[PDB]
């Protein structure tokens, strides 16, 4: 699957940044896992991840610093507690988990600059 996310996003003074992650085509699924990853010099580390279903469209409830609502084939993501040093490349990974077939796609990454 194709995954679209913005090239560049400016975080707030409060350390908050929002950006959408959208995939296509909108294959049948009942379980979508969205993982946010940070690229750090060869290593990809997990920032936060959740699983969206038809009844649970509001995700990352178990994270203080990550929020996300899912609709159509689009997650609107919000990362909090960003610092200047947290400037970097944030990749949206999308997985269609059930039922078969499995699909996986990886966004190009959103560069996040922190004011």
């Amino acid at each position, epitope marked *: 699957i194709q995954v679209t996310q913005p090239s560049v996003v400016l975080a707030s003074s409060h350390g908050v940044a929002s950006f959408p992650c959208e995939y296509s*085509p*909108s*294959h*049948n699924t009942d379980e979508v896992r969205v993982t946010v990853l940070r690229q750090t010099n060869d290593q990809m580390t997990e920032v936060c991840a959740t699983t969206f*279903t*038809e009844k649970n469209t509001v995700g990352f409830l178990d994270y203080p610093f990550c929020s996300g609502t899912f609709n159509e084939s689009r997650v609107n993501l919000t990362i909090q507690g960003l610092r200047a040093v947290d400037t970097g490349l944030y990749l949206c990974k999308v997985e269609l988990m059930y*039922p*078969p*077939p499995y699909f996986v796609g990886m966004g190009n990454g959103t560069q996040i600059y922190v004011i």
Partner: nanobody
Amino acid sequence: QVQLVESGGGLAQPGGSLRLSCAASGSTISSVAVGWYRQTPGNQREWVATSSTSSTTATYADSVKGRFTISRDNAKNTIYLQMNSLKPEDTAVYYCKTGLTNWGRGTQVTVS
């Protein structure tokens, strides 16, 4: 955005066949995996099968594997579920779906 319309439902005898249709309007489903689900009285909609895509083959639940077949008709922007060797327990309302929540209106299938 895609509106899905089921048809072909009705009554069949045990051992009989029905061909269900999921016709899409709005945009094309030529490239979208389309799922089929069935709902018995008092239960949740349950996955039955998903159509092929450019990169994947059709998939089936083991309860219908070998009896049911999904085929495409791009020109009619439609997916077909061929239902052979029907059983009374195949009785249900059948829905097609794309994405997470884009359900059709469902069509009743009754096997005596």
